[PDB]
Design a protein around this nucleic acid. Structure first.
Ligand code: MG
Ligand code: MG
Lengths: 202, 175, 151, 50, 191
RNA sequence: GACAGCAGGACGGUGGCCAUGGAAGUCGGAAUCCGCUAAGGAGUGUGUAACAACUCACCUGCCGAAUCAACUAGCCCUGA
C-alpha cells in the first residue's frame, strides 16, 4: 500500500486544484470526529474541506508542471496543522462568519483555554447520590425537595488550570457548558490574491 | 590447506585424458588461492572433483601459473564470497577487505575467518573474489575508511618491550 | 426524554429502568402499563423506546432502529413456544422495503443523498442480506439506482 | 486521601515490571532483567493489582 | 568495529566560564563554581572561540561501549552548565498515611530529621551532602525543597530521604507512605 | 520527510449480530462492510459487575536522516 493510494491522493489534489481556483486556509487544532461530521454535513451544499500530510506541499510540483501563475506564495502558509477549503460559488463574503458554529459542550481533561467556570445556585436535578465528586472537591450542598441545591458559589477551574478527570465528569453531570472551540480561518486565497486578514476579509 | 604465511594466487587449468570415447577435453580453468603451487594443484583437484566428473587418475593438469598483481601500488577493495562450514552447518557469506593485492586480501580473509568465526582452513571454501569499486561497499568499516582528507592520530602508542634496559629511572610518556 | 433499548415481553417482573423517573415520580406501574398499549402489535422483538414526560405523562416514541427493523422484516411472529430451529433462517427479498427504510432514516446517518446507503444497508445485515438469487458481494458493485430518485 | 499523591505513590511503587525468573523490580517499560542471576531474560509480567 | 572519531558539540553561554587543565573541568558562574574529574574515561576535551565558547568532546577509535561513554561526558557537561546557571530544585511532597510525618531541619538545613513515620517511635535523622540546602515550602502542605548545584549530590540526598522513608516488613502496595521526589526543576524560573 | 520523543484526533450506521448472570468495540460462538474521510481497525489491552472514562493499530503538527524485524554462529554470562 501507500504507493497507488498516494498517487490517487495526488489525483484528488490535482482534480481539486484544476477544478476550484478559490481557497480558504483553516486550522483545526482543537476538533473532534463528530465535530468534523457536523461541519461536513453542514457544508455539503458548498465548499469542500481537505486536510492532509506534508504531501499538501504539492503546488511546487504543480508549478513544475509549468501550467501556472505565481501560485507559489501559498507554499509557506502550510505550517502547523493547515488545511484547505476549496470553493467555486462565492464571490460572496458571508461564508464562515454566518457559518462559524460553536461546539456543543465537549469536555475533556487537558484544556486550559480560555476562561473560568462558575457554578450558580440552582436545582441540579441529580439522582441518588452524585455527591462523591462534590465531596472529593469540596462544595457545600444542601438537599431541598429532591433536587440538590448548592449553598455557596465558588469557582472550580480558573484560567490556565489543567482540567482533571473528576472535574470533567462532574461538569458533564452538572451539564454546565465547558470549554468549546472550533476551527479558525487564517488566510483567504482568491485568484492569485494575497489577503491580509488583520482586518481585510469579510 | 594449512594457509601458512601469506597466500598466493594460482591459475591452474586441467582436463581429462584423451580417450577414444571422447577426444579433446574441454580444458577447464580455475583461480586457486594457496600458499604454494602443490597445494594449488591438490585443491584444484578437490574443487574440480566436487564440480564435475574428474579425478586425478583420469585427468591431468595442463598448466599451473603464479598470478601476479595487476596493480600492487593501489589500495583496492575486494569482496570475497565464502562457503565455510561451521559447527552446526555450513553457511554462505559475503565479506569485504581493503588491501593492496588479491592474495593479501584473501590472506586477511582466511586469518579473519579463523579469528572471529573459529573456522579452520578445512572448512573455508573461497567461492569468488571480485574487486568492487567505491559507493558499492556494504560494510560500514570500509565505508568509513572511504574518506578523503582523512585525519586520525595514534593515541597511547606503547612499544619497545625491553629493547631498552630492564632497569631504568625512566617512565615512558606515550604519544 | 428517557431512552431504553430493551424488549421481549413487557415484563414487570420486579425489574424496570426507572432511575431518572422517580425524581419526577410519574411512572411506577402506570407508565409500564401504558408502554404495553403503545407497544402492542409492533412487535414481539427488541425495539428502541424514548419517553417524553411533562410532569404527569409518558409519551412513548419508538425510533425505528435500522438493524431492528431489518430483523423485524423476517417472517412474523416468533417470540417463544417452539423457537430455536435455529437462529438465522432469513429468506427475504426486501426489494423496496429497505429503500423505504432509509427514506425514513432522517438525521441519524450523517449521509450522502442515498448514494452508498444501498451498500451500507446491504452489507450491514447479518441473516438475510439479499434476494435469494444473487450475492451481496456483487451488490457492492451492482446497480446504482435510487440516488437520483430520492432527492 | 489526596488521589494525586496516591497516583504519585503508585508511580513510584506499583507500575513496575516484575520478572518471572530473577524476581527483580525493574521499570514499567523494561525489556530484560538487569541482574546477572538469571541471564537477562525477557520473561516479564506486570506487578499485580487488586 | 573500531569506529573513527565521534565528536559532541557544547555551546557555553556568556554568563559562565570554563577552564580545563586536561580532563578536569572547572565551570565558574554566578551561582558558585563546580569542578569535576573525568580521569577514568580518556576522551579528548577541547574548546574554541574567542568569547564564543564552543566546547568539543572528541574521541578516537575506541569501542562501542566507549562511543556510548563519549555522550555521557557531553551530558554531564550540560548538567554542570545548567547547575551553575540555574541550579537544581527538587520538590518532594510527603505522601503520608494515617500517621503524618514531621519533617524538620536541624543544622542549618543540612540535617533533615524525620518523625512519627507511620507510628514508629524512632526519630529518623538523615544527613545531607555538602553543597545542598533544604527547606520546608510555603503555601503548600508538607512539601520539601532541596536546592543545590551538583545534580548528583542533590539527587543522592533526595534518594537518601526517599530510602529512609521506606515501609519495612509489610506490603508496600498498601501503606503508600514516604517522601517521594514529586517535581524536578531549576531554581531560577522562566528559563 | 520514516524510526523513537512531545502534542492532537481515534467517529456515524450500531447499545449490530448468537446470548439476557452482562456485552453498549472489551468472558465467549460466527464473522467483516460502507460513509466522513486526516483516520478509526464492527476493534490490542487496562477497567467500573455492566452503562461510561483510559490506551493501542491508524492519522496529523515540530524534529531531522538513516531506521526496524526475524533467524544464524564465535567469545562471554545464566542454567551449574
Ligand atoms: Mg504479613
Ligand atoms: Mg561456564
Amino acid at each position: 500500500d501507500r504507493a497507488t493510494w498516494k498517487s490517487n491522493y495526488f489525483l484528488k489534489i490535482i482534480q481539486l486544484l484544476d477544478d476550484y481556483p478559490k481557497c480558504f486556509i483553516v486550522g483545526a487544532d482543537n476538533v473532534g470526529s463528530k465535530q468534523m461530521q457536523q461541519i461536513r454535513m453542514s457544508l455539503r451544499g458548498k465548499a469542500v474541506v481537505l486536510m492532509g500530510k506534508n504531501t499538501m506541499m504539492r503546488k511546487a510540483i504543480r508549478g513544475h508542471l509549468e501550467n501556472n501563475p505565481a501560485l507559489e506564495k501559498l507554499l509557506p502558509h502550510i505550517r502547523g496543522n493547515v488545511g484547505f477549503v476549496f470553493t467555486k460559488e462565492d464571490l460572496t463574503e458571508i461564508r464562515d462568519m454566518l457559518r462559524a458554529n460553536k461546539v456543543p459542550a465537549a469536555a475533556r481533561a487537558g484544556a486550559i483555554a480560555p476562561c473560568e467556570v462558575t457554578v450558580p445556585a440552582q436545582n441540579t436535578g441529580l439522582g441518588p447520590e452524585k455527591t462523591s465528586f462534590f465531596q472529593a472537591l469540596g462544595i457545600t450542598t444542601k438537599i431541598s425537595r429532591g433536587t440538590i441545591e448548592i449553598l455557596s458559589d465558588v469557582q472550580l477551574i480558573k484560567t490556565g488550570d489543567k482540567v482533571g478527570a473528576s472535574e470533567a465528569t462532574l461538569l458533564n453531570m452538572l451539564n454546565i457548558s465547558p470549554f468549546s472551540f472550533g476551527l479558525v480561518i487564517q488566510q483567504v486565497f482568491d485568484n492569485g490574491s494575497i489577503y491580509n486578514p488583520e482586518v481585510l476579509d469579510i | 590447506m594449512k594457509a601458512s604465511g601469506t597466500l598466493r594466487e594460482y591459475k591452474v587449468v586441467g582436463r581429462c585424458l584423451p580417450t577414444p570415447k571422447c577426444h579433446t577435453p574441454p580444458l577447464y580453468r580455475m583461480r586457486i588461492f594457496a600458499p604454494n603451487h602443490v597445494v594449488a594443484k591438490s585443491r584444484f583437484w578437490y574443487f574440480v572433483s566436487q564440480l564435475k566428473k574428474m579425478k586425478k587418475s583420469s585427468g591431468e593438469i595442463v598448466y599451473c601459473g603464479q598470478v601476479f598483481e595487476k596493480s600492487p601500488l593501489r589500495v583496492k577493495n575486494f569482496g570475497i564470497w565464502l562457503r565455510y562450514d561451521s559447527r552446526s552447518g555450513t553457511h554462505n557469506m559475503y565479506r569485504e577487505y581493503r588491501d593492496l593485492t588479491t592474495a593479501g586480501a584473501v590472506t586477511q580473509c582466511y586469518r579473519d575467518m579463523g579469528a572471529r568465526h573459529r573456522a579452520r582452513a578445512h572448512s573455508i571454501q573461497i567461492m569468488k573474489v571480485e574487486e568492487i569499486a567505491a559507493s558499492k561497499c556494504r560494510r560500514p568499516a570500509v565505508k568509513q575508511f572511504h574518506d578523503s582528507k582523512i585525519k586520525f592520530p595514534l593515541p597511547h602508542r606503547v612499544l619497545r618491550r625491553q629493547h631498552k634496559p630492564r632497569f631504568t629511572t625512566k617512565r615512558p610518556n606515550t604519544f | 426524554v428517557y431512552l431504553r433499548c430493551t424488549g421481549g415481553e413487557v415484563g414487570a417482573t420486579s425489574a424496570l429502568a426507572p432511575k431518572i423517573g422517580p425524581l419526577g415520580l410519574s411512572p411506577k406501574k402506570v407508565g409500564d402499563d401504558i408502554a404495553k398499549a403503545t407497544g402492542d402489535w409492533k412487535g414481539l422483538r427488541i425495539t428502541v423506546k424514548l419517553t417524553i414526560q411533562n410532569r404527569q405523562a409518558q409519551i412513548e416514541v419508538v425510533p425505528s432502529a435500522s438493524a431492528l427493523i431489518i430483523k423485524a422484516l423476517k417472517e412474523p411472529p416468533r417470540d417463544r413456544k417452539k423457537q430455536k430451529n435455529i437462529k438465522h433462517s432469513g429468506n427475504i427479498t426486501f426489494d423496496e422495503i429497505v429503500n423505504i427504510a432509509r427514506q425514513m432514516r432522517h438525521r441519524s446517518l450523517a449521509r450522502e443523498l442515498s448514494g452508498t446507503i444501498k451498500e451500507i444497508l446491504g452489507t450491514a445485515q447479518s441473516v438475510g442480506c439479499n434476494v435469494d438469487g444473487r450475492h451481496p458481494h456483487d451488490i457492492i458493485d451492482d446497480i446504482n439506482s435510487g440516488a437520483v430518485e430520492c432527492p | 486521601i489526596e488521589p494525586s499523591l496516591r497516583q504519585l505513590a503508585q508511580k513510584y511503587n506499583c507500575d513496575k515490571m516484575i520478572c518471572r525468573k530473577c524476581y527483580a523490580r525493574l521499570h514499567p517499560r523494561a525489556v530484560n532483567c538487569r541482574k546477572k542471576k538469571c541471564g537477562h531474560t525477557n520473561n516479564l509480567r506486570p506487578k499485580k493489582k487488586v | 568495529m573500531k569506529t573513527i572519531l565521534s565528536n559532541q558539540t557544547v555551546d557555553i553561554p556568556e554568563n559562565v566560564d570554563i577552564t580545563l587543565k586536561g580532563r578536569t573541568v572547572i565551570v565558574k558562574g554566578p551561582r558558585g563554581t563546580l569542578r569535576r574529574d573525568f580521569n577514568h574515561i580518556n576522551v579528548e576535551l577541547s574548546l574554541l572561540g574567542k568569547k564564543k565558547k564552543r566546547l568539543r568532546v572528541d574521541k578516537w577509535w575506541g569501542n562501542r561501549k566507549e562511543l556510548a561513554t563519549v555522550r555521557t561526558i557531553c551530558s554531564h557537561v550540560q548538567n554542570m552548565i545548567k547547575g551553575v546557571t540555574l541550579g537544581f530544585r527538587y520538590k518532594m511532597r510527603s505522601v503520608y498515611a494515617h500517621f503524618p510525618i514531621n519533617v524538620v531541619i536541624q543544622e542549618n538545613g543540612s540535617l533533615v530529621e524525620i518523625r512519627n513515620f507511620l507510628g514508629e517511635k524512632y526519630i529518623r535523622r538523615v544527613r545531607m551532602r555538602p553543597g545542598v540546602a533544604c527547606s520546608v515550602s510555603q503555601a503548600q502542605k508538607d512539601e520539601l525543597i532541596l536546592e543545590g548545584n551538583d545534580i548528583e549530590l542533590v539527587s543522592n540526598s533526595a534518594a537518601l530521604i526517599q530510602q529512609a522513608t521506606t515501609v519495612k516488613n509489610k506490603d508496600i502496595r498498601k501503606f503508600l507512605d514516604g517522601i517521594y521526589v514529586s517535581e524536578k526543576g531549576t531554581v531560577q524560573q522562566a528559563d
